[PDB]
C-alpha cells in the first residue's frame, strides 16, 4: 500500500471533524468538541491503488510552535474547508494557504478547497466565487455535506490524486 498524509484545515465550526469522522467511521456527528485534534488512519482503494490514509483533523487554538510546525509540515496535502453559509470562513482561506506555504517552504503544495454544509438551504458563499478562487490557486474545489455524505469521499480522494500529481 501507498501512504498519504492529509491535513484537514479551516476555521472553527466549518465541519473539519464531521468530515473526518464521516470518511473514517461512516457516520455523522451532531457535535464534536472543537478542542480535540486527533490523527486517524484508514485503508481504502483509490483508482485501483490500495492506499493508507493518515488524516490529521486540526483543532484547538490559533497557536504556533516549532513542534506544531513539524506536525503540519508532515502533511503532504491539505483540505482547506470553509462553510457555504459562513462568509468569514471563506475569507479566512487565504490565511490557511499562506501558513501551509510557510511550513512547507514551497509555493506548490497539494490542496483542495472544500465548501462544506452544502445540504443547507441558506448559502452566503456562491459556488462561483469559490470556483474562481480555486482556479486562481490552480486547485480543485469540491462541495460537500458531512451530514448527507455528499462529496465526502470525492474531497479526500481528489486530494490524494493531487498528491499523486506532485509525484
Amino acid at each position, epitope marked *: 500500500s501507498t501512504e498519504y*498524509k492529509l491535513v484537514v484545515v479551516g476555521a472553527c465550526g466549518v465541519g473539519k471533524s464531521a468530515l473526518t469522522i464521516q470518511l*473514517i*467511521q461512516n457516520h455523522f456527528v451532531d457535535e464534536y*468538541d472543537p*478542542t*480535540i485534534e*486527533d*490523527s*486517524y*488512519r484508514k485503508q481504502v482503494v483509490i483508482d485501483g491503488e490500495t492506499c493508507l490514509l*493518515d488524516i*490529521l483533523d486540526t483543532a484547538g487554538q490559533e497557536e504556533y*510552535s*516549532a*513542534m*506544531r510546525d*513539524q*506536525y503540519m509540515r*508532515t502533511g503532504e496535502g491539505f483540505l482547506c474547508v470553509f462553510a457555504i453559509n459562513n462568509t468569514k470562513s471563506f475569507e479566512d482561506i487565504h490565511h490557511y494557504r499562506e501558513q501551509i506555504k510557510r511550513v512547507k517552504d514551497s509555493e506548490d503544495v497539494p490542496m483542495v478547497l472544500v465548501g462544506n454544509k452544502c445540504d443547507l438551504p441558506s448559502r452566503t458563499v456562491d459556488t462561483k466565487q469559490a470556483q474562481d478562487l480555486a482556479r486562481s490557486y490552480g486547485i480543485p474545489f469540491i462541495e460537500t455535506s458531512a451530514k448527507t455524505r455528499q462529496g465526502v469521499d470525492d474531497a479526500f480522494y481528489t486530494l490524494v490524486r493531487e498528491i499523486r500529481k506532485h509525484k
Partner: antibody
Amino acid sequence: EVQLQESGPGLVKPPGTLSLTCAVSGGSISSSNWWSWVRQPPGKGLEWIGEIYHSGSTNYNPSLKSRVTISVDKSKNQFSLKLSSVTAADTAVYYCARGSSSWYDLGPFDYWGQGTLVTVSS
Amino acid sequence: SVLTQPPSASGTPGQRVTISCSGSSSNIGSNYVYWYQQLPGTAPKLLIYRNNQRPSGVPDRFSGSKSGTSASLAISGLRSEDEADYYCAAWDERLSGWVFGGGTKLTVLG
C-alpha cells in the same frame, strides 16, 4: 490535549484479579495511536505492561503475557487492564498512556495519566 | 530493567552532566531511544524523542545522542528544577515490546 485517568480498586486480594480502567477525554480512542499500561513499584523503575490499538491488536510484555489482558471500549472512550494471578510483587503505581502516533512519532508514551496505586496483598 | 543506566548522577548548578543508557543490538542498536523525566511525585514526561529531538517546552540545554548499542542524555546549565529521575526507553525486537532503563536519580547539589 488528550487526558487520561486511571480508576479501579486500590486493594486487590489474590485469587482476585487486578482490574483497571482508563477514561480518555480530549481525544478519541479511535485515533491512530497506541494505548499502553505502564507500572512503577514504589521507589523502583518503570515497566511496560502492554499496548492496544483501537482495532483490537495488542502487544504485551513477554514477562507478563500469560497474565495480561488489555481491551478497548470504543463506546465509553476507554481502555482497560486485567492482570490475573497477582502477588504482592504486583504492587505498583499503574499508569495508562497514549503514544506511537501514526502521524508524527514522539515515542510510546506521549501522554500519561496521573497513575493509581494498587496494593496487592492476600 | 532490560536497558542499563547508572543508578544516580549529580552535578552543581551551572555545570554539565551526562546520563548513559546501554542496551543491545535488539533494542538500542536497532531502534530509536526516547527519554522520560519524572519529577518527584509526578508522572514521567517525554524529554527527548528519536535519539536527539526535543518536544515543546524542553530547552536546548537537554540533548540526546545514540551511538551503537548505547545512548546518552546530556544536561548542561544544570538547574535545581532538573533534579528528577531520568529513564531511557526503546523497542526491543527480540521481545517485541517496549523496554526501559532502570532509572537514574539526578541530584542537583545543594
